[PDB]
C-alpha cells in the first residue's frame, strides 16, 4: 500500500541530525562529517606567479615589435628581485613569482628566440598566464562546508592549508539485536526447526561499514522480560536501535505489545519487492527500525530505508545512496504491477562498449546469492509489468557494502 | 614513452600473492580475501519447508472436496509432531518444517474458511510450494572459492551454513614515508621555501581504505644514513614500501644512489597525464613504489598503478579497479596526442535521462580540487587530440577512495 517515497520522506522529515562533535587528526577522518566549515588560513597561491614557462613582459615593449633581450630570471622559489630595464623581458618558469609590474607571460613556443633578443608573435593579451594570489583559495573563504563527508578528495587539501585537525560529528551509535527460539549461534548445533542467525551479522557489517558505532546485544531470548530489558539497554546508549529479526513488524504477538508499550511505532506495509512490512518510530531516546525476518527483505529494507536515515542522522548533507542510470536490459525480466521491484542484476559492457543489464537469475527471496552474483539493482517502476530484451530500465549500482 | 597497460602488466607479472593466512570470525572479515574455499557442511535448506503462509495438505483429502479441520500447526521453531489423521490439514507458516506425509502446500488466497474446517478453492499440484531440502546448496559443495573478497553479500551466507570463522589471507603490510627538508608537518609554521606534506597523508588514507596495514614512518630528514635506515626497516616488515615524495623518480641525487644500492629499481617514464615518472622494483624482501612529488600525479599514479598492485598481492582474484563506460561529452576537451590523459570530469544525468560528462575545469596539476569536484576520470585515448561536444568518450567513475 504505502510507497517507498512516502515512507522515506516520512522518516527523514522526523529526524534531526546529530551535532555533538569531536576533533580529530586528518588521518582519522575518512568518512567523517565535518561539523563546521573549514576556512582557509592562507592565500593559495600565495602570490601572483607564472602559468607557463617562457617570458615575463610589459605590454609597452611588445609594440616595439623588436627583440626584447633577457634582463634577468625568476624560477620556482628564486624570484627576480631587481631593476627591470625598459625594452627587456624576463625568462620565467611555471610556479615562479612574476616580477614587479609584469603585465603578461608568453609561452616560449609562441615566441621564436634569437642570440640577441626575444622576438614575439601572437598578440599578448593582458594578464595572460598569470595566476593571481588567492585565485584558487582566498584566505578567509570557505573551502569545505559543514556537512561534507571527508575523503581523499578533501583531507589532502585541508592538510595543504596547514590544518592538523578538524571538528567532525560524532559517529552515530546504533544498537542491534535479533530474537527467536529458532535462532542459533554459529558453531552451536542446529536443533529441530532451527536456523543460524544471518540478518544480525548482515546488519552489523553494514553499520560498521557505514561508519557507525555498533552495539550488538546478540540474540535475545523469547521472553517479554528478556525483551524489555534489551530495549531499555539499547535505547539508553544508541541514537538508533535496530531489530534484525524476530520483533514484530505487524503480526499480533507479545513483542508487538512491548514495542507499543515503549514508544510510538508505526507498522508500514511498503509497496516494494522483495519485502513489504517494516516497523519504525520513536522510543524514549532513540529511533527504532524493525526489519522483516526474511534475509532478502531485511537486507533490502535496511539498504533503502535505514541507510538513508543514518546518513541524515550523521550530519551528512549529500544523500547517501548511489545515483541511478538508464540502461538497456539484455534479459526478459518478470515483474508484476502493483509493486516497486528491486531486482538484482549484473551491469556489464557489451561489444559496443555501452552498458547493459542481465538478470542475476531467479529473483525469489528464498535465496541470498543474488547479492553476490549481482552488482546492482534493476529498479522496476511500480506500475510496470514484464520487460523484454532491449527495453530501457533504471539501474542502481551497489555500493561498497556489497563489493 | 612507456604505456600504462605495459607498465601495469610488467608490475603485475612479477608479483606473487600472499598466502600467509589467519583465522577470524565473520564479523571482522569485511573486505578480507578468503584463503581457502568455503565448503558447505549441510544442505540448504536443511529440511523440506513451506514456501508460504497456508496449510499443509494431501491430494487425497483435497480431492474429497470438503473442509479439512486443522489438526495442528507448524511454526518457525515449532515443528508439528502430532497425529494428523485423514481428512485434516496442518496450518503452516513460511519456513516451517513441512509435516511428515505432507504432499503439498496451498497459500491463503486459495483457501476459504469454513465452520467445519477449511475449503480449498484452487487446484493443488503435486509437490507445490514445498521448498525441498537441498535445492539451493548441497552438502560438500563449494559455496565461495578461495580468492573471494568477503562482503555483505557472502558473509551472511557463510553464517547461514553455521560457520563462525574462516581463514583469510593476512592484510598486506605497506610502509610509507617521505623525505626532504622543505616538508613541514601540519600545524608547524611554514619556513621559507617550504610546503605542507600532503601526498603522505593521501596515500595513508587510501591504503587504509584498501584494507592494508599501514606503517607510516613520517618525514625522513635529508641524510643518506637516516634514509637508508628507513628503507632497511620498511623493507624488513612490509611487503610493499612506498615513497610518497622526495625519493628520486629519475632525477640524479643521493636518494637515487641509495635506491640503486638497496634494490633493483627501474625508473619509468609513462605516457600518461598528469605525470610521467614513476619508480618500481624489488628491494631485498618487498616491492617498492616511488611516486612523483606533485599531488595530482602521485594520486593518479597511486590509484592506477599501486592500487591494482595491492589488489593482486592481497590474494584477491577480481581486478580491483572500477570498470569504464562509454559516454557523451557535454564539454569540449583539450587534449594533446602523445599521452593517455586521465582528466577529471563530472558524470551526471541530463533531461533525457542519459549519462554525460562535463569537465571539472582546469586539468592542470597545480590544484587538487578537481578530485573533489569530480566524480570520474575521462580516460582520453593516447593518440586522440581534442574532443568536441557530442563525441563518445570513455569514463571511469571514482571509487570509494574519493567518495
PDB file of N, CA, C and O in Angstrom, chain B residues 370-399:
ATOM      1  N   UNK B 370      40.031  19.350  -8.493  1.00  0.00           N
ATOM      2  CA  UNK B 370      39.319  18.546  -9.466  1.00  0.00           C
ATOM      3  C   UNK B 370      38.923  17.171  -8.874  1.00  0.00           C
ATOM      4  O   UNK B 370      37.926  16.592  -9.306  1.00  0.00           O
ATOM      5  N   UNK B 371      39.685  16.644  -7.900  1.00  0.00           N
ATOM      6  CA  UNK B 371      39.344  15.350  -7.289  1.00  0.00           C
ATOM      7  C   UNK B 371      38.078  15.479  -6.489  1.00  0.00           C
ATOM      8  O   UNK B 371      37.278  14.564  -6.443  1.00  0.00           O
ATOM      9  N   UNK B 372      37.897  16.635  -5.866  1.00  0.00           N
ATOM     10  CA  UNK B 372      36.697  16.929  -5.095  1.00  0.00           C
ATOM     11  C   UNK B 372      35.480  17.218  -5.973  1.00  0.00           C
ATOM     12  O   UNK B 372      34.385  16.720  -5.715  1.00  0.00           O
ATOM     13  N   UNK B 373      35.673  18.021  -7.013  1.00  0.00           N
ATOM     14  CA  UNK B 373      34.552  18.493  -7.789  1.00  0.00           C
ATOM     15  C   UNK B 373      34.115  17.418  -8.716  1.00  0.00           C
ATOM     16  O   UNK B 373      32.979  17.421  -9.227  1.00  0.00           O
ATOM     17  N   UNK B 374      35.032  16.494  -8.946  1.00  0.00           N
ATOM     18  CA  UNK B 374      34.807  15.455  -9.918  1.00  0.00           C
ATOM     19  C   UNK B 374      33.987  14.358  -9.312  1.00  0.00           C
ATOM     20  O   UNK B 374      33.469  14.482  -8.191  1.00  0.00           O
ATOM     21  N   UNK B 375      33.826  13.326 -10.114  1.00  0.00           N
ATOM     22  CA  UNK B 375      33.348  12.043  -9.682  1.00  0.00           C
ATOM     23  C   UNK B 375      33.787  10.941 -10.639  1.00  0.00           C
ATOM     24  O   UNK B 375      33.408   9.772 -10.470  1.00  0.00           O
ATOM     25  N   UNK B 376      34.579  11.326 -11.646  1.00  0.00           N
ATOM     26  CA  UNK B 376      35.234  10.359 -12.511  1.00  0.00           C
ATOM     27  C   UNK B 376      36.430  10.906 -13.307  1.00  0.00           C
ATOM     28  O   UNK B 376      36.730  12.110 -13.364  1.00  0.00           O
ATOM     29  N   UNK B 377      37.053   9.933 -13.957  1.00  0.00           N
ATOM     30  CA  UNK B 377      38.113  10.124 -14.905  1.00  0.00           C
ATOM     31  C   UNK B 377      37.533   9.971 -16.289  1.00  0.00           C
ATOM     32  O   UNK B 377      36.816   9.026 -16.571  1.00  0.00           O
ATOM     33  N   UNK B 378      37.904  10.884 -17.160  1.00  0.00           N
ATOM     34  CA  UNK B 378      37.656  10.775 -18.568  1.00  0.00           C
ATOM     35  C   UNK B 378      38.930  10.284 -19.125  1.00  0.00           C
ATOM     36  O   UNK B 378      39.886  11.033 -19.192  1.00  0.00           O
ATOM     37  N   UNK B 379      38.977   9.021 -19.492  1.00  0.00           N
ATOM     38  CA  UNK B 379      40.247   8.419 -19.844  1.00  0.00           C
ATOM     39  C   UNK B 379      40.430   8.643 -21.315  1.00  0.00           C
ATOM     40  O   UNK B 379      39.911   7.869 -22.137  1.00  0.00           O
ATOM     41  N   UNK B 380      41.148   9.709 -21.665  1.00  0.00           N
ATOM     42  CA  UNK B 380      41.286  10.072 -23.071  1.00  0.00           C
ATOM     43  C   UNK B 380      42.391   9.325 -23.739  1.00  0.00           C
ATOM     44  O   UNK B 380      43.519   9.341 -23.300  1.00  0.00           O
ATOM     45  N   UNK B 381      42.012   8.720 -24.849  1.00  0.00           N
ATOM     46  CA  UNK B 381      42.837   7.802 -25.585  1.00  0.00           C
ATOM     47  C   UNK B 381      44.131   8.473 -26.023  1.00  0.00           C
ATOM     48  O   UNK B 381      44.168   9.641 -26.402  1.00  0.00           O
ATOM     49  N   UNK B 382      45.201   7.694 -25.953  1.00  0.00           N
ATOM     50  CA  UNK B 382      46.550   8.205 -26.105  1.00  0.00           C
ATOM     51  C   UNK B 382      46.765   9.020 -27.335  1.00  0.00           C
ATOM     52  O   UNK B 382      47.348  10.090 -27.264  1.00  0.00           O
ATOM     53  N   UNK B 383      46.364   8.482 -28.472  1.00  0.00           N
ATOM     54  CA  UNK B 383      46.549   9.210 -29.735  1.00  0.00           C
ATOM     55  C   UNK B 383      45.552  10.306 -30.000  1.00  0.00           C
ATOM     56  O   UNK B 383      45.750  11.100 -30.872  1.00  0.00           O
ATOM     57  N   UNK B 384      44.462  10.332 -29.274  1.00  0.00           N
ATOM     58  CA  UNK B 384      43.433  11.297 -29.561  1.00  0.00           C
ATOM     59  C   UNK B 384      43.950  12.673 -29.297  1.00  0.00           C
ATOM     60  O   UNK B 384      44.768  12.863 -28.407  1.00  0.00           O
ATOM     61  N   UNK B 385      43.460  13.615 -30.086  1.00  0.00           N
ATOM     62  CA  UNK B 385      43.630  15.027 -29.844  1.00  0.00           C
ATOM     63  C   UNK B 385      42.327  15.509 -29.244  1.00  0.00           C
ATOM     64  O   UNK B 385      41.648  14.746 -28.538  1.00  0.00           O
ATOM     65  N   UNK B 386      41.960  16.758 -29.531  1.00  0.00           N
ATOM     66  CA  UNK B 386      40.846  17.400 -28.839  1.00  0.00           C
ATOM     67  C   UNK B 386      39.550  16.699 -29.119  1.00  0.00           C
ATOM     68  O   UNK B 386      39.436  16.030 -30.123  1.00  0.00           O
ATOM     69  N   UNK B 387      38.586  16.902 -28.227  1.00  0.00           N
ATOM     70  CA  UNK B 387      37.265  16.291 -28.265  1.00  0.00           C
ATOM     71  C   UNK B 387      36.172  17.357 -28.221  1.00  0.00           C
ATOM     72  O   UNK B 387      36.166  18.232 -27.342  1.00  0.00           O
ATOM     73  N   UNK B 388      35.217  17.255 -29.132  1.00  0.00           N
ATOM     74  CA  UNK B 388      34.175  18.270 -29.229  1.00  0.00           C
ATOM     75  C   UNK B 388      32.939  17.784 -28.515  1.00  0.00           C
ATOM     76  O   UNK B 388      32.761  16.561 -28.322  1.00  0.00           O
ATOM     77  N   UNK B 389      32.102  18.736 -28.118  1.00  0.00           N
ATOM     78  CA  UNK B 389      30.805  18.406 -27.565  1.00  0.00           C
ATOM     79  C   UNK B 389      30.123  17.382 -28.490  1.00  0.00           C
ATOM     80  O   UNK B 389      30.171  17.529 -29.704  1.00  0.00           O
ATOM     81  N   UNK B 390      29.590  16.301 -27.919  1.00  0.00           N
ATOM     82  CA  UNK B 390      28.869  15.286 -28.684  1.00  0.00           C
ATOM     83  C   UNK B 390      29.632  14.011 -29.006  1.00  0.00           C
ATOM     84  O   UNK B 390      29.031  13.030 -29.427  1.00  0.00           O
ATOM     85  N   UNK B 391      30.948  14.008 -28.832  1.00  0.00           N
ATOM     86  CA  UNK B 391      31.738  12.812 -29.140  1.00  0.00           C
ATOM     87  C   UNK B 391      31.705  11.764 -28.022  1.00  0.00           C
ATOM     88  O   UNK B 391      31.477  12.052 -26.852  1.00  0.00           O
ATOM     89  N   UNK B 392      31.932  10.526 -28.409  1.00  0.00           N
ATOM     90  CA  UNK B 392      31.989   9.452 -27.457  1.00  0.00           C
ATOM     91  C   UNK B 392      33.336   9.520 -26.754  1.00  0.00           C
ATOM     92  O   UNK B 392      34.308   9.983 -27.292  1.00  0.00           O
ATOM     93  N   UNK B 393      33.369   9.027 -25.534  1.00  0.00           N
ATOM     94  CA  UNK B 393      34.471   9.283 -24.642  1.00  0.00           C
ATOM     95  C   UNK B 393      34.408   8.217 -23.552  1.00  0.00           C
ATOM     96  O   UNK B 393      33.330   7.820 -23.184  1.00  0.00           O
ATOM     97  N   UNK B 394      35.534   7.705 -23.074  1.00  0.00           N
ATOM     98  CA  UNK B 394      35.498   6.679 -22.028  1.00  0.00           C
ATOM     99  C   UNK B 394      35.624   7.314 -20.683  1.00  0.00           C
ATOM    100  O   UNK B 394      36.415   8.240 -20.496  1.00  0.00           O
ATOM    101  N   UNK B 395      34.886   6.761 -19.729  1.00  0.00           N
ATOM    102  CA  UNK B 395      34.799   7.304 -18.392  1.00  0.00           C
ATOM    103  C   UNK B 395      34.961   6.180 -17.364  1.00  0.00           C
ATOM    104  O   UNK B 395      34.468   5.086 -17.564  1.00  0.00           O
ATOM    105  N   UNK B 396      35.661   6.475 -16.271  1.00  0.00           N
ATOM    106  CA  UNK B 396      35.948   5.522 -15.204  1.00  0.00           C
ATOM    107  C   UNK B 396      35.579   6.203 -13.903  1.00  0.00           C
ATOM    108  O   UNK B 396      36.399   6.948 -13.379  1.00  0.00           O
ATOM    109  N   UNK B 397      34.361   5.952 -13.398  1.00  0.00           N
ATOM    110  CA  UNK B 397      33.872   6.504 -12.117  1.00  0.00           C
ATOM    111  C   UNK B 397      34.834   6.335 -10.977  1.00  0.00           C
ATOM    112  O   UNK B 397      35.492   5.282 -10.856  1.00  0.00           O
ATOM    113  N   UNK B 398      34.957   7.376 -10.166  1.00  0.00           N
ATOM    114  CA  UNK B 398      35.784   7.318  -8.983  1.00  0.00           C
ATOM    115  C   UNK B 398      35.216   6.281  -8.062  1.00  0.00           C
ATOM    116  O   UNK B 398      34.015   6.158  -7.962  1.00  0.00           O
ATOM    117  N   UNK B 399      36.058   5.581  -7.329  1.00  0.00           N
ATOM    118  CA  UNK B 399      35.548   4.641  -6.355  1.00  0.00           C
ATOM    119  C   UNK B 399      35.445   5.278  -4.965  1.00  0.00           C
ATOM    120  O   UNK B 399      35.513   6.476  -4.814  1.00  0.00           O
TER     121      UNK B 399
END
